Design a binder for this molecule. Structure first.
Ligand SMILES: Nc1nc2c(ncn2[C@@H]2O[C@H](COP(=O)(O)OP(=O)(O)NP(=O)(O)O)[C@@H](O)[C@H]2O)c(=O)[nH]1
Ligand SMILES: Nc1nc2c(ncn2[C@@H]2O[C@H](COP(=O)(O)OP(=O)(O)NP(=O)(O)O)[C@@H](O)[C@H]2O)c(=O)[nH]1
Ligand SMILES: [Mg+2]
Ligand SMILES: [Mg+2]
Lengths: 416, 416
């Protein structure tokens, strides 16, 4: 039987494991190992219908030849596990056990892999957990459907920038863009009168939101430039709300009869738009098309980097900004102390009596501390505590180095 | 005639102006100026129905004595300006021109003020813009309604942490908690079968979601502790979806007949739950009750700080993390160079011929530069560049100080 397979597992201690046995069983089988691969992923915030969408992609993948691939209207939606409720469902990364072999309009036979991912910003996950899942799914997929609710907000762009930057760090250097197709899929688009449901309205909507212009503030420009530089092809699809039954009914199990017809109409456009043979983007790494065996080799290698400690840790705004503020303030403070001591006992300055040098040092040290205490920082004195002690500990070291210099110039005259 | 008044203006260059004349005209009037004040605010992501909600608060405020204050089912919703479309409507902060005078059950007559705010994360706003509006509405309000769509995600908690932290920085030091009542208002709650609509289901949902435990990762703990430490009273209300007409219909103008009965039923509970006489939290700053007169003074004082450059700038995850990584790497790299030069030309060391010292310095500088280059940082080499040049420029300054120490020990012997 075909089924979902857990491939990347996120542990309770926030570490990550790759099930290589399971991965090899699927992608290294003789029928597919040497086929060029198309990898489709859906990712984004938790509880927003990723698995559900992905299960409709499955119906299409199996029954694409039929005009009614969308399914019997009384049949439940199965595959990757999905359900209602406010608690996250999908964890780590899972792939469908059956790799699809599809013929492209070029006579080419390709392997199609489907990837479902753990939602970002659930309440048991560190930012590192979420970033790793998102990054890994982006580096591996050739088509990434970035799933969003109702609108494309500035915080959505910021997250994407962060998560994709985390992906870039783990990759070999290239002048080419790191990734290929990105789709901003907007669920519950509420304004068809302004931008139509689907790809055309979506495209117009996205071009307005990702626009970079001369008078746009750099912070706004930069997050946008980052996204443009990452992906070869960027598109947007606006999907209508599927109706409150889909949203609210604890008994709903996916029967098309319970889904609003305008949603079904746009869904039938969306899936082939993603996944028809003419649309299947072959995975390229470093500008080279990759086979299923090669994809397994990049997957192992990338995971290894995220399991290690070479990468910087992803951090929240408060945490990262607090660190930045403190580090910068320690540097100014120390550097102020250091310039001033140079005027007292630099190499071109005379011997100073050690009692007087200690008095000037205490003066100068204190000025640097008061200087540091006085700079406002995220998040206040509490967070600063360990940095202030570092500042003092580091100034004392400089002072010790100055003492040695001063002592090498010592003058003593015997006198009654 | 009562109406909305623009009180805080955000300019196109991202600066802030207070309309004091307008503020004084409203809050310094002889009837209200000396009355203890209750300030109600709504804040959160743009396009989520903040103003719409507030206009229902206005209906309750005018008609609280009637059981049917919610209105005639054909009456359009007016007051603060609201509409559909994906582009933000409300900018800055506006207050209702009419201050409501209400008698509390203890016989006190208090003044009630309403605040509508510019939504966060729109595509024309810097993070500082958003942070400033949210912070200011929180510092001024005694009741802050934190408006969320569908769920409370880890990113929502993070935004709230940052924004409230930005507010604390502008405030006087105190052992008391900086703020009073916070309401997590969840719009379009989809799981009444799990947690009931309203305050009781919200309270249970929020206690699960804001819970701090021993085995929870510090990052999850810290965002929670911060929120507990900021607010005196924290509550949650789960609100049903108002129906797709309200969400989707460009002609909808607020008539209750077009709004789902379950939403209306719950709306009728929510507003008095927020704003009934027994519920009206009198504004306290530093543990002291504030009059309308006093509030205007704090509003002016806080604004000055946000107009200045005393505060740290709010930054995105990538911007702050990139800076932290770079600052930290420059300090290690410089510190490595510095220790090594100490073994060569500290005060306890012999004279070294300047040609040889230069050779040692170049060796050492290069080692520190590689050390810096080898550390992976967000986001890569481009961003690291201004820092690397600073690193080289700062090492050269150190070298210049060492040259002087060394020259002070010079040995020259004349010999044929
Ligand atoms: N409002 C809305 N709800 C949807 C939509 N599609 C699916 N849902 C509902 O979303 C709920 C969760 O779906 P699911 O696919 O499990 O979401 P997920 O993104 O995979 N969740 P997780 O990140 O926890 O795996 C279900 O009750 C489903 O009916 C949509 O377009 N809009
Ligand atoms: N889904 C949903 N839509 C709602 C709800 N309440 C109001 N709306 C719709 O949301 C839209 C925006 O309402 P509005 O009050 O202007 O929102 P806002 O949060 O003040 N927006 P802004 O930040 O741009 O000023 C309107 O079309 C309104 O009908 C709700 O609970 N759920
Ligand atoms: Mg899922
Ligand atoms: Mg508004």
């Amino acid at each position: 039987k075909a089924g979902p397979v857990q491939v990347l597992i996120v542990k309770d201690d926030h570490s990550f494991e790759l099930d290589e046995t399971a991965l090899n069983r699927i992608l290294l089988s003789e029928a597919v190992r040497d086929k060029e691969v198309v990898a489709v992923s859906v990712a984004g915030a938790f509880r927003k219908g990723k698995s559900f969408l992905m299960d409709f992609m499955l119906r299409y993948m199996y029954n694409q030849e039929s005009v009614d691939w969308v399914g019997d209207y009384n049949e439940p939606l199965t595959g990757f596990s999905w359900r209602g409720g406010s608690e996250r469902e999908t964890t780590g990364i899972q792939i469908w056990s059956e790799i699809f072999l599809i013929n492209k309009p070029d006579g080419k036979k390709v392997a199609v892999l489907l990837m479902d991912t753990q939602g970002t910003f659930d309440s048991q996950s560190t930012l590192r957990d979420s970033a790793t899942v998102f990054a890994l799914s982006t580096m591996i997929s050739s088509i990434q459907v970035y799933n969003l609710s109702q609108n494309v907000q500035e915080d959505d762009l910021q997250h994407l920038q962060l998560f994709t930057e985390y992906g870039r760090l783990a990759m070999e250097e290239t002048f080419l863009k790191p990734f290929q197709s990105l789709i901003f899929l907007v669920r519950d688009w509420s304004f068809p009168y302004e931008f139509s449901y689907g790809a055309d309205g979506g495209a117009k909507f996205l071009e307005k939101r990702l626009k970079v212009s001369g008078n746009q503030h750099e912070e706004l420009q930069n997050v946008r430039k980052h996204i443009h530089s990452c992906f070869t092809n960027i598109s947007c699809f606006l999907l209508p709300h599927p109706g409150l039954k889909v949203a609210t009914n604890p008994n709903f199990d996916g029967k098309l009869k319970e889904i609003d017809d305008e949603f079904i109409k746009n869904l039938k456009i969306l899936i082939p738009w993603l996944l028809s043979p003419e649309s299947l983007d072959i995975k390229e790494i470093n500008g080279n098309k990759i086979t299923c065996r090669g994809l397994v080799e990049y997957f192992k290698a990338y995971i290894k980097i995220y399991q290690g400690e070479e990468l910087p840790h992803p951090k929240s705004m408060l945490q990262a900004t607090a660190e930045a503020n403190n580090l910068a303030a320690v540097a100014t403070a120390k550097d102020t102390y250091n310039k001033k001591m140079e005027e007292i006992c630099g190499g071109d300055k005379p011997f100073l009596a050690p009692n007087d040098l200690q008095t000037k040092h205490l003066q100068l040290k204190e000025e640097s501390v008061k200087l540091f205490r006085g700079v406002k920082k995220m998040g206040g004195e509490e967070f600063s505590r360990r940095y202030l002690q570092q500042l003092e500990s580091e100034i004392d070291e400089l002072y010790i180095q100055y003492i040695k210099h001063n002592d090498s110039k010592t003058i003593f005259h015997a006198a009654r």
